[PDB]
Design a protein around this ligand. Structure first.
Ligand SMILES: CCCCCCCCCCCCCCCC(=O)OC[C@H](COP(=O)(O)OC[C@@H](O)COC(=O)[C@@H](N)CCCCN)OC(=O)CCCCCCCCCCCCCCC
Ligand SMILES: CCCCCCCCCCCCCCCC(=O)OC[C@H](COP(=O)(O)OC[C@@H](O)COC(=O)[C@@H](N)CCCCN)OC(=O)CCCCCCCCCCCCCCC
Ligand SMILES: CCCCCCCCCCCCCCCC(=O)OC[C@H](COP(=O)(O)OC[C@@H](O)COC(=O)[C@@H](N)CCCCN)OC(=O)CCCCCCCCCCCCCCC
Ligand SMILES: CCCCCCCCCCCCCCCCCC(=O)O[C@@H](COC(=O)CCCCCCCCCCCCCCC)COP(=O)(O)OC[C@H](O)CO
Ligand SMILES: CCCCCCCCCCCCCCCCCC(=O)O[C@@H](COC(=O)CCCCCCCCCCCCCCC)COP(=O)(O)OC[C@H](O)CO
Ligand SMILES: CCCCCCCCCCCCCCCC(=O)OC[C@H](COP(=O)(O)OC[C@@H](O)CO)OC(=O)CCCCCCCCCCCCCCC
Ligand SMILES: CCCCCCCCCCCCCCCC(=O)OC[C@H](COP(=O)(O)OC[C@@H](O)CO)OC(=O)CCCCCCCCCCCCCCC
Lengths: 820, 820
């Protein structure tokens, strides 16, 4: 199932949007586009201003969503930063909720820039998401319970049934809250939700209820004085928003309008409802994006607001470009007023006007294609989107008057040229499998355009001669040609999207010795494809598995050459149509990974012992001294074999490794743990534990010339060894490394402690459990966490960075299979 | 103004109730009592069961009111105790909200039994009261904001005006919340409200909103399928409840019904609204009292629930008796069905039936008179109420069938005889000025009966021959005679309610020496009236001022003889028509004061130095050793003068006292501080500080034979003394007392520290400020708090107990005037 999870969820989303579009088309048979436009023109200025006010109130409540999340996890951040990240995250989530533009992605980027651990960012995202979903369910259930007899008749449903649905929902929520009184993680199968204390989720319930009330008030004020009061439309709006977010359609664009049109058909004229929905979409979705984009652009023109806005601009501009191209496509489909048509006919040629219409349509589709590249800071995407926006500005001033269209396009161009510096990546737009979410957006825009064409020109029949009509008489030929062009080019886009050595290892080892990370010596295994930097200074060892390029530890090389290497690895993985995965990265590289659109997830702690402060003849290692002394009394001796004179000992090294592999029912792992390749083990010094002449324990010592850090990859123990062989081998290797001039020693990886997992996300479902399972499977081959704690090391968190907003499940499983 | 505050507030409450009653009478001109009864009989059983369910839900939310208050102050109490005290407090507050039956009084009694400090009880009461009031204002304002256009037309008011009222209220509340972000006590003139943190008041807002929703749902379900939805009636109900609680009428009995009748006149037939209001009053007010009373009675029949219910039973029974007598009066006014009338005529004599009607009316009035005595655990009140209830049971089975009336009366008798033990006090019902609140209740019941008579027999004219009609034809003669009897007897009740030595001091001093409280020696001043115990073992020194018998320190004498003395003092003060006040009582007597209906308020801390652990040659008194040594180097010497050889030194004792009184611009206080009476000072040993032959400082040493504790009353310092005379005199007296065999020494009283006042009530208005002002005025004549802290004493809180639920302002001011 998860082999095609993205494809199946995208197909289901497009199918649900198709059902919604058909429902709107069927429910608006008596509504004509002229009636919709007349309702739009007759809307009161008071209504629009009051809708703007309630949009502002809703987004303030969203700011407090994020504020409450940060307060719950304990972190304190300055209010301008939290307000800006919350406003941007919600302005993009309410518009484009798929992978790179989800509110979670915005929050991760901004909070990583703001100085939050990935666990803290995950906790904030989980708190906010569970808050919105659960509070929306609760508020909708209470509103439905209140007014089932007032809004039930509108859809010819008895109020008792809606009341019972609301009661069932409220009973489920009450059972969840009561079963999760004080901690006490309740499991509903895969998910394991741990609700906050009553005070926190109570304040969050006020925040979420006020948010939903303000948004419903936006749309209600934009409605033309209906018969149902505010509570009625509020429950209707809560149900519609719940269904829209549950359908995974971007912004719920189909389902929300479908539900509201289907519901208010009897109460309000559907042309007025459609005009109100159009104006609500415009205000509540475009105006926040325009406000955020303009604020950041002005801050760039003229403190820390500038830096956080620079971090957030690529995604805000990607969302705005998606909306802008959607606008261009829809405006191509919808007809120009006759007055504007005759005005342009008085000045412009016919062929120029028709070509401008078709090109504006195709340029809108090109803009929503290049929006993904804008989200990735692509220089080519900046050029394509800038020129497409400028040409569409001109072609909208030509194919019509398009005052607001031209204003929006010019504002996009302004914000795009003001933020030029942020788009410098050299990857190519047309060399990438786009996304399940991005093809979902393309398909939604295209099908919406087709349905809008069928709705606008429903009265006019489909004549085969309508294709070639040109003489300004009607834009049905123009709309039909634009829709055909959109369909063809989008199908082309979808079709296009769905259609080692020895010197490398040598240079990698040269780089490894030139730097100070001992674990980089795993490149010698030869099973990792090596990706070198542009200068060759740094490299990224990686292995390909499934649909992911699972990179190993941090890019190895000079410090300043690492961010560009991370960017280049991610872009190259996308070029091969794969999602880049960084396995076991240090916290130092999280910000650079975050810029590359990679979200990190903690999967263990790397035990580091500082050899400068390690003196075994001290009180901090009493159990260690006892175990070492008893091992000495058992007859074990430790020697360091140089890599050149190994093989005569390598033969029974293979013997002891095979015996230890037989002793514990485990296979030979790779790509992250020691694999007994005779050349690999020969290439490095091997600390070996010898007893009674024969050797019973050995451990590949990982070293670097700079002597910043040393480590051990694999160690094996024959049953002839005593129980303290592990402790004695570690102590001897650590002492040898300290004597030789090493600052720190890497004990390896350990799974996260239970106390660390206690402060976990409110709504994480399987990520924590699968991280724990992976840690148990792979990190216990070199001593348990208690054993490594016996050395009193400096625990360093290690993270798993995944790309494209994909789930940690699939990347973690791909890494698990690559190791196994 | 405060000289007659109780009278003016009672008169205003009765006037507001009269306006409300006239409004109901004017709004129900077209409604006949037969229509009301028909609507009552035709109510659906489903409606009644669902109203019971929502009453239960509302009272659960009230339990959580008190739970949230206790959580906010930090105290943890077992849930059964909190639930029982909250249920009882709200069942009585929703019915009889005046002095002895307010929810605050119930909470103080129960929480004192549960082990809460009076400051903690004050904080809980303030949190709960501010929660209800502020949350009701907020929820009503939001509901009105939502539906001003849906409920505005019902009273012919434009929705814009109700919306603007709601917006003004919400703006005021938002300004208060924002101005009180983190602590930051906001002052609105007299009051100083410090809102809790957002999480606490958010959970409390959910609790209060659910409470109001459940109560509004009770009444809405009891309504007959109106045209306005639940939000409409909910805002109407919130406004009605706000006005009812704001009018101080018991249970809002007039104003709530007035508002709802006036509002729903157009939507619903007013006979149906009146029936719904009657049934809502019955359910939501009687059923909780019946439930609590029955639960406690069963617990008495068959663990700690029994003890807390025994504590709460007198007040629950007083509230139930008030409702029961109200029922009896109303049933006397309202007519019996003709079928029951002919059934009783078939078996009973005419004169017996008419006498039973009149006597049932007068017995209901007698029951609501004896309810106050029941609240005071009076044995005579138990007898009067029991016999009145039994005779009214029989007279209701005689004057009518009265199945529910007889059931309620029999249940009252059952609960009254089951809880017989609790009513043992020997005071007299008819020897007390009743209360402003109790005359308010009497007047409300009487005026309601008069208006119900005018409403039932509005169609029938007022014929002078209606007085003497007797032959079962109609109960208009019976109702008119009963109403006249009620009016006459209530006027009689209101008219009736509004219409030292040397051997005593000798016996008081004998008791003082026989016990171990040194401060009891203030009785020797002779200005305190002395009230001895029945055996004469113990006494209460007290002084009368204003309308209060301001008792001094704890009753002096044997430990077990004190509770009865406290009870007897309170009862005697009520007999003289005065509110007993206990000044500076120890925490040990709070529970006994709480049983006597006295609520304590902390007014300072009494500094106690344990002489057993006091060794001046230790590090704990370095500043003391330095000051004593410097005073010695200044030439001051300390001597102890026995009480018999004083006067030769008393002459310049008067000299030095006069000089010190002149030095500090203060007068000669009394009743709590040292007054220079030559006999008084002669009667006790006087530690005197002599320098260069003359004496410059002296201090009346207060002693007891049992040597449990010693103290000092007044000390004076001529300007010839140095700055350390106070310290040296205290140190010398303390050392002398320790040597003579005293366990502890009383430094005196100090005002509360600022840190102590930081954990103050959310909504206390003037009590804290006036307590601080009184402490500053009176407790700084013997060294400041820092000075007394230089001795490192054991701070003991001292409380001010006031009676009858009167405000601490007036009792504290009376004490201030008595001292000055
Ligand atoms: C009736 C419900 C009972 C159970 C039904 C089935 C259960 C299945 C459980 C599925 C779990 C999650 C699935 C995918 C959710 C997801 O992937 O997202 C997470 C989202 C936060 O998302 P996010 O935090 O990122 O952003 C939020 C904002 O931006 C997006 O809203 C917009 O689009 C804006 N345009 C409008 C908002 C305006 C506010 N200013 O939370 C959720 O799970 C949502 C769950 C909601 C559940 C349905 C609510 C039903 C209403 C109650 C009435 C019931 C009556 C039913 C009768 C038919
Ligand atoms: C299932 C799918 C089918 C659809 C169902 C949904 C129902 C509706 C939902 C909302 C759709 C709206 C989209 C349409 C936008 C568009 O067609 O634009 C055109 C307009 C003006 O354009 P134009 O300038 O050319 O008109 C000329 C004028 O200005 C000059 O006339 C004057 O001034 C007057 N004096 C003359 C009066 C003459 C009278 N005869 O744009 C706007 O409304 C504002 C710009 C914002 C548009 C962006 C919309 C995107 C929001 C959607 C969010 C969902 C996100 C999903 C992502 C996948
Ligand atoms: C519109 C308001 C704005 C300002 C108006 C004037 C301000 C004056 C301020 C006066 C301060 C206090 C005065 C005396 C209050 C008092 O002495 O008491 C304290 C009580 C808790 O009392 P308590 O805790 O003891 O018990 C509670 C329960 O038992 C009693 O309720 C019952 O009787 C039950 N039968 C029914 C309850 C069912 C629940 N289960 O809180 C308060 O201050 C109350 C203040 C309320 C303010 C008015 C609310 C207005 C609604 C908003 C809509 C406005 C529209 C206006 C249009 C005209
Ligand atoms: C992450 C966000 C999640 C938001 C979820 C919102 C869900 C709201 C609707 C469901 C609420 C069901 C509550 C039913 C009671 C269950 C028992 C219970 O919860 O007991 C808790 C206490 O229960 C409550 O206090 C409940 C308060 C709310 C009561 C229900 C209100 C529902 C909403 C009513 C709105 C009505 C409005 C009408 C007028 C507009 C125990 O609390 P604790 O000990 O965990 O608290 C620890 C403390 O915080 C530490 O400081
Ligand atoms: C003692 C009980 C008092 C109850 C009072 C209830 C009043 C509710 C109505 C008025 C609310 C006005 C709030 C306006 C915002 C003012 C700014 C503000 O309050 O900032 C605070 C934060 O503001 C908020 O979070 C406000 C949350 C609620 C937002 C407003 C909701 C109003 C109710 C809407 C219901 C809508 C329902 C419609 C559908 C039914 C700061 O909090 P803090 O730092 O003091 O918190 C400390 C923390 O708790 C320590 O742990
Ligand atoms: C805790 C509190 C919880 C509840 C909070 C409630 C919030 C207040 C709701 C008040 C609703 C009153 C609703 C109300 O009172 O309506 C009253 C009135 C109704 O007008 P009509 O529809 O009758 O007008 C018809 C003709 O007169 C029009 O010409 O509205 C207006 O006149 C126009 C108002 C314009 C307002 C312009 C605002 C512009 C804002 C621009 C900035 C946007 C961002 C702002 C960020 C903050
Ligand atoms: C967090 C959650 C916040 C929201 C909480 C909402 C609470 C649930 C509201 C559900 C309203 C459904 C309302 C609803 O669904 O009504 C449905 C239904 C409506 O009946 P009709 O008026 O159509 O009946 C007409 C004829 O059939 C009558 O014979 O009600 C009934 O049939 C009778 C119900 C009796 C219920 C008996 C309860 C007895 C309780 C006795 C104990 C009292 C103390 C209880 C202490 C707890």
């Amino acid at each position: 199932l998860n082999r095609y999870r993205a494809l199946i969820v995208a197909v289901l989303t497009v199918a649900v949007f198709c059902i919604a579009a058909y429902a709107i088309y069927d429910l608006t048979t008596e509504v004509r586009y002229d009636d919709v436009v007349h309702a739009l023109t007759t809307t009161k200025i008071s209504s629009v201003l009051l809708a703007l006010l309630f949009t502002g109130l809703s987004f303030a409540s969203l700011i407090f969503y994020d504020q409450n999340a940060l307060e719950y996890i304990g972190k304190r951040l300055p209010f301008p930063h939290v307000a800006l990240t919350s406003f941007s995250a919600y302005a993009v989530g309410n518009t484009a909720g798929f992978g790179a533009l989800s509110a979670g992605a915005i929050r991760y980027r901004a909070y990583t820039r703001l100085g939050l651990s990935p666990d803290d960012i995950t906790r904030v995202i989980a708190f906010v998401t569970l808050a919105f979903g659960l509070g929306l369910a609760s508020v909708g259930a209470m509103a439905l319970l209140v007014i089932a007899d007032e809004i039930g008749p509108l859809i010819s449903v008895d109020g008792l049934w809606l009341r019972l649905i609301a009661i069932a929902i409220l009973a489920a929520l009450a059972f969840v809250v009561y079963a999760g009184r004080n901690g006490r993680e309740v499991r509903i199968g895969p998910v394991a939700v741990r609700l906050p204390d009553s005070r926190t989720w109570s304040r969050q319930f006020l925040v979420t209820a006020f948010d939903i009330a303000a948004s419903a008030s936006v749309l209600y004020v934009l409605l033309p004085e209906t018969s149902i009061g505010w509570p009625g439309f509020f429950a209707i709006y809560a149900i519609a928003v719940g269904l829209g977010v549950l359908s995974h359609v971007p912004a719920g664009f189909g389902v929300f309008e479908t539900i509201i049109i289907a519901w208010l058909g009897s109460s309000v004229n559907e042309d007025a409802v459609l005009s109100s929905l159009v104006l609500y979409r415009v205000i509540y979705n475009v105006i926040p994006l325009v406000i955020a984009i303009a604020a950041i652009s002005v801050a760039e023109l003229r403190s820390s607001m500038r830096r956080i806005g620079a971090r957030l601009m690529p995604q805000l501009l990607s969302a705005f470009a998606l909306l802008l191209g959607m606008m261009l496509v829809f405006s191509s489909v919808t007809p120009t007023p006759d007055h504007n048509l005759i005005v342009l006919s008085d000045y412009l040629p016919l062929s120029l006007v028709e070509s401008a219409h078709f090109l504006s349509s195709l340029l809108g589709l090109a803009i929503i294609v290049a929006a993904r590249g804008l989200s990735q800071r692509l220089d080519g995407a900046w050029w394509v989107s800038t020129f497409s926006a400028l040409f569409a500005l001109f072609f909208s001033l030509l194919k019509a008057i398009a005052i607001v269209e031209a204003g929006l396009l010019a504002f996009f161009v302004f914000s795009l040229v003001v933020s030029r510096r942020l788009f410098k990546r050299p990857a190519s737009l047309l060399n990438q499998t786009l996304t399940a979410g991005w093809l979902t957006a393309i398909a939604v825009v295209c099908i919406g355009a087709i349905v809008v064409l069928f709705f606008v020109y429903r009265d006019v029949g489909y004549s085969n001669e309508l294709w070639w009509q040109f003489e300004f008489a009607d834009e049905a030929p123009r709309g039909l040609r634009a829709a055909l062009g959109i369909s063809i080019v989008s199908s082309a886009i979808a079709i296009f999207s769905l259609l080692v050595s020895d010197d490398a290892v040598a240079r990698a080892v040269e780089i490894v010795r030139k730097q100070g990370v001992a674990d980089a010596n795993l490149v010698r295994m030869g099973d990792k494809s090596i990706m070198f930097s542009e200068k060759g200074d740094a490299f990224i060892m990686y292995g390909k598995q499934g649909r992911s390029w699972i990179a190993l530890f941090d890019p190895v090389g000079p410090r300043q050459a690492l961010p560009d290497l991370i960017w280049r690895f991610v872009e190259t993985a996308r070029a091969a149509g794969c999602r880049s995965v960084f396995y076991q990265i240090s916290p130092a590289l999280l910000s650079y990974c975050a810029d590359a659109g990679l979200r990190a997830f903690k999967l263990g702690e790397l035990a580091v012992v500082n050899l400068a402060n390690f003196e075994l003849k001290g009180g901090k290692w009493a159990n260690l001294r006892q175990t070492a002394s008893r091992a000495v009394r058992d007859g074990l001796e430790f020697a360091v074999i140089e890599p050149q004179d190994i093989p005569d000992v390598l033969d029974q090294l293979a013997h002891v490794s095979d015996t230890w592999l037989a002793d514990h029912n485990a296979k030979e792992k790779s790509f992250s743990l020691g694999a007994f390749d005779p050349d690999y083990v020969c290439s490095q010094p091997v600390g070996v534990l010898k007893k009674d002449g024969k050797i019973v324990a050995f451990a590949n010592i990982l070293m670097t010339e700079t002597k910043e850090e040393g480590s051990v990859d694999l160690m094996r123990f024959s049953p002839d060894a005593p129980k303290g062989s592990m402790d004695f081998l570690f102590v001897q290797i650590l002492e040898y490394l300290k004597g030789e001039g090493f600052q720190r020693f890497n004990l390896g990886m350990a799974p996260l402690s239970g106390m660390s997992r206690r402060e976990s996300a409110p709504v994480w479902d399987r990520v924590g459990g699968t991280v724990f399972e992976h840690g148990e499977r792979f990190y216990n081959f070199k001593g348990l966490r208690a054993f490594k704690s016996k050395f009193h090391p400096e625990w360093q968190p290690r993270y798993l960075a995944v790309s494209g907003g994909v789930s940690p499940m699939i990347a973690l499983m791909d890494a698990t299979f690559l190791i196994g």
